[PDB]
Amino acid sequence: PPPTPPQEETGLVRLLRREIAAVFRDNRMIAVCQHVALSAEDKLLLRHQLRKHKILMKIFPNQVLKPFLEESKYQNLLPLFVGHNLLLVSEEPKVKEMVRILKGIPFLPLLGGCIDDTILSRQGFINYSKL
Amino acid sequence: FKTLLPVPTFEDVAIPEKPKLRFVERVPLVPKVRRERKNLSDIRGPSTEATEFTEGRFAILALGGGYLHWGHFEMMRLTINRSMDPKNMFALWRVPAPFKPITRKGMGQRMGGGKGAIDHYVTPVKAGRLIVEMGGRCEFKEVQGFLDLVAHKLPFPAKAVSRETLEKMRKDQEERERNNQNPWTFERIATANMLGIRKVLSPYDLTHKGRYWGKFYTPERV
Amino acid sequence: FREVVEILDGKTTIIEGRITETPQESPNPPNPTGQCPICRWNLKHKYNYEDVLLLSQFIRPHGGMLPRRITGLCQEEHLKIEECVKMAHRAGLLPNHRPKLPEGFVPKSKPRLNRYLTRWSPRSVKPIYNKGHRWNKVRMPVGSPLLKDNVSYSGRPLLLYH
Amino acid sequence: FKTKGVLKKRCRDCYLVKRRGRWFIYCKTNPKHKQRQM
Amino acid sequence: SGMIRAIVRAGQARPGPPLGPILGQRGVSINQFCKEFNEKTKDIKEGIPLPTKIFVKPDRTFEIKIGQPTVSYFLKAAAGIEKGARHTGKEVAGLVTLKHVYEIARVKAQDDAFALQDVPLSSVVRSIIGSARSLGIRVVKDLSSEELAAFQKERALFLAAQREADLAAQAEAAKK
Amino acid sequence: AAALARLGLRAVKQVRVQFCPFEKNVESTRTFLQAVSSEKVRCTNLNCSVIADVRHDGSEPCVDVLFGDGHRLIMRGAHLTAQEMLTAFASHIQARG
Amino acid sequence: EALAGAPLDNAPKEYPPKIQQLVQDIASLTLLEISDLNELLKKTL
Amino acid sequence: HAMGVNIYKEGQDVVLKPDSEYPEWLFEMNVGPPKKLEELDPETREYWRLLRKHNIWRHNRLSKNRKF
RNA sequence: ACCAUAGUAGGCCUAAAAGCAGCCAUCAAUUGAGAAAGCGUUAAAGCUCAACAAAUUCACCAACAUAAUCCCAAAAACUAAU
Ligand SMILES: [Mg+2]
Ligand SMILES: [Mg+2]
Ligand SMILES: [Mg+2]
Ligand SMILES: [Mg+2]
Ligand SMILES: [Mg+2]
Ligand SMILES: [Zn+2]
Ligand SMILES: [Zn+2]
C-alpha cells in the first residue's frame, strides 16, 4: 500500500464527541433501544409520551459513537450498536414509566442499558422496575 | 454518516447587463463587393488568436478547424440563451460575425467562365480556439451539460472546458511528450530531414509537427 | 463454506445455517508483501484459460464467478480471471461445475462441438457471409484482449484475430 | 422497439441489458421506452 | 379515505368552493361539517381564519381537528396592515416589536404541530420572526415612541407606495 | 423491507423474533426485525402482531412465523444472512397462503 | 477502566463482592458498635 | 377586519406587558441580518446546519440537467 | 438498498397558483429533510430526489443500417526472430 494518509477530525465529529461525553455524564439512565421504522405520527407521539415523564430521546451515528464507546468505560455495550439504534436518555430515572410506554408497542424492543452505573439486559430493567 | 464539505462560494462574480448572447448579422453591414480567393490556410494548423480565457471561466473549445456560417451562430445563440439563468450566468462571443465571402455558381454550369457570385459569409476557426465563453456564479457541471450540445452541433469536433479542465489537458499534453519512451519523434525526424523525409512532408509540417493534418487535429500525437 | 439447510416436518419448516470446513491459503507465498492473491504467488501474466487448477479456486459449485471483495483480486486480474473462466467453460473444461438437472441429461443434442479460446458466446454470433477482400477484411476474434499481456516465450505477440 | 445508435434511459424505471450481442433498454412501466442499439 | 387541510375564516363556512369540490369529492356531507365547524368557530369572535385538519373516513363519515389560526393573519393584524408586501424585503409592509411576536407565539404554542414538540417559546418566536421576514413585516427591539413616529411616517409612505402601485397598475392594466 | 410490502403480508397470523442482544451473531436477525417492523409491512394487515423477545441467556437467535395455512415457518438465524431470511420468508410465505 | 458484563436470568447465582464484604464487616462488630452503627444509619436516613 | 393602531390604539387593542416581565431571549434574537457562513464558528452546530443547507442548494442546482 | 413529519395555502398578481404559470424573499422546528431538484393536480392530494440514520468491490467520457451474376486464397492465438 501507499504510505498512510491520516484523516482529520471535523468540527462535526468533535461536537458529537463532546455532546456524547456530556450525554453519558448527565443522565443516570441510558437505555439502548433498537430504532424501528414507525410513522412520523407515531414517533412524535412516542416523543411526547416520553415528554410526559420528562424522559428525552437521542440519536447518534454508529460511526462516531462506536470508537467513543470502545475507549469508554462503557465498552461492554459495543455488541448492542451493530444494527440500527436509538439512545434513551433519562435524568433522575424512573424505569417503570419507560417500560410502560415500551409495553404499548410489542415490536419495539429494549435491549441493553445502564441504570446508575449498572449495566443491564432487558430483564435487569424488568427487575429495576418492580423495585 | 457522511461528513460535509465546504461548498464553493462566488462573492466575486459580477454579472454584466445583457448577459444573453447578442444577435449577430447574416451579412456584414458593408457587404464585400470584391470576391476573395479562398485561403484554406486560415482553417489550417493551430490557432493563434483567442486561445485564452478573458472574463469567463467556461468555454467551448474547437478541436478541429472549420467554417462557422450564420446557421451555426443562430443555433448557438438560441440554445444557450434559453438554456441559461440570465441572473446567475453570462455568455460572450469569442468569435467575430461572419466576414468572409464564399462564392457559388448556379448548379449546372460548365467549368470556367469566371468566378462565381457571393452566396454567403463565414468565419474561419482554427483548432484550439474558444468559440463561446460563459462566466457566472455557476459550477462547471451545469454549463457543461448544456454546452456539450452546442459543442456537438458545431462543424468541427469540439469540447466544453473550464479553466481547470484546459490547463489540465495542456499539462497532460506536455507531460505526455516528456514521458515518451520511443526516441523517434516527428519533430526530431522532420527538422533534421532524416531519410530525406522532407520530400514527402509539407513545409508547414515543421511547425505542425505531425499533430495537425489538413484541418484535422489529433491531440494524441505528442 | 456455509451450507443452508431446509427441512419439512408436519407443517413446520426449519431453515438453518451450518458451517463446514474451509481449506486455507497454502503456507508459504513467494511474494508475501504482494497485495493481490494472484500477485503474491507470482502468477501475474502467467495463467491462461487453460489453467484450470488456478481458475476453479474462484467460482461457485454451480459454475459462476465469485465476487471480487470476497476473493480480494486486483480489479484488473478479476476481469482477466472472469474472461478465462468463461473461456474454460466454453472449452469443455470444468464439466463438474455445471448445475445438476436429472431430466435434461437424457435429451441428447448434436454432440458438443469442440472449441477453445472462444471470446463470445456461441448463441450470439452472426455468421459472416461477406468476408471481404484483402483490404477490408472481416476478422474473427480468438481469445480475449484482456490476456494480451501474458508472457510470450516466442516473442511474437499473440494473434487475437483471424 | 426502436433501433437507435445511442441508448439513453427516458425515465428512472428503464434498465439496460446486454442480450444477443447487443445492448437494449427495457422498461416495464412505459413500454414506449424500449430501445435496441444498432 | 385520507386527510384534508382546510384554512377557513371564523364565522364563514359555505357549501361551495373550496369545500364543495374538496369535501364533495370525498363523498362527505358538506352541511353537517358546516354545522359542526360553525358550532366550534362561532365561539371565536376574534374573526380569525384557522387551518384545520379534516380526517375523512372510508365510510364517508368524518372527524375534525381545529388548530390555531395562520401566522399570516396574526402578523397582518400585529402590523395593522391588510395585504403583505408585493416585493418582500425590497419594501416594507408593516412594523412590530418583541411584544407582538411573543403574544402570537404563546398563542400558537397550543397549535397541533407545536403541541407535541416540547420546544421553548424562543423557538416558536424564531419561527414567527422567520414567517415575518417573508410577509414583508419588520421586527424592532424597542420601538414604541418611534413606533408611533414611524406609523405616522411609514403609513404615509405605504399609502404613497400603495397609491403609486395602484396608479401604475391602472397604467399597466390600460397598456395591456 | 420494500419487497415484503409489495407481497401482501395479510396472509400471516403471528410473527415473533427471539434473539440475544449481547451475542456477536445477531445482526442478521435484527435486520430481519427492522425489515418486518417497518410501516409498510406493518400496515399491510392489522390482524398480525409482531413480538420482540429479548433475552440475554438464550444464546440462540430465532424467527418464528405462523400463518393461516395452518403453517409454521421457523428459521433459526445463526449463520443465516438477513436477505436470505427475507427471501426464504418471501418465497415460503407468499407461494403458500 | 471497564464496567460490568450483565449476567442474567437462566443462570445467575452470583451476588456482588461489596455486599458480602459489607455483611462481613457488619458481622465482625461488637453490639456496642452495632448500636452505634444503627444510630448513625437511623439519623442519616 | 381592520384596525388602525396608534400609541393609544396599539396599547389599547393589546395587553402589553412591562419591560421587566419579558424574557431575555426575546431581546437576543437577530432582527433583520440572517447569519452568513463566514460569521459562524465551525465548532457550533448551527454552522453545520447552514453548511448542510448550502450543500443541498448546490445539489439542487446541479440537478437542473435531469432528463428524468 | 433505506427512509420522509414542522410554522405553511410563505407574501403577491390571477377563476384558482397549496414545494413546483409567473414576480420577490429563501427564513425557521426537530439528530435530521430545499419556502423544493424532477414527475403529477383545475388548485390539491399523490409518487420520487436530495436529509438523517443504515451501510459501504468498482463505477468521468466512450457504442452508428445498406445493392444489385457467386463469399472470396487456404489457414493459424507460442519449441526461443534485429
Ligand atoms: Mg460535430
Ligand atoms: Mg434545520
Ligand atoms: Mg433520499
Ligand atoms: Mg435497415
Ligand atoms: Mg476462397
Ligand atoms: Zn495484483
Ligand atoms: Zn422508462
CSV table of C-alpha atoms (C1' of nucleotides) and ligand atoms in Angstrom, one decimal, chain C residues 131, chain I residues 71-74, ligand 5:
chain,number,residue,atom,x,y,z
C,131,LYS,CA,-15.7,-11.9,-45.5
I,71,C,C1',-18.4,-15.5,-50.3
I,72,C,C1',-13.7,-14.9,-51.7
I,73,A,C1',-6.5,-17.8,-51.1
I,74,A,C1',-6.3,-21.8,-47.5
J,5,MG,MG,-12.0,-18.8,-51.2
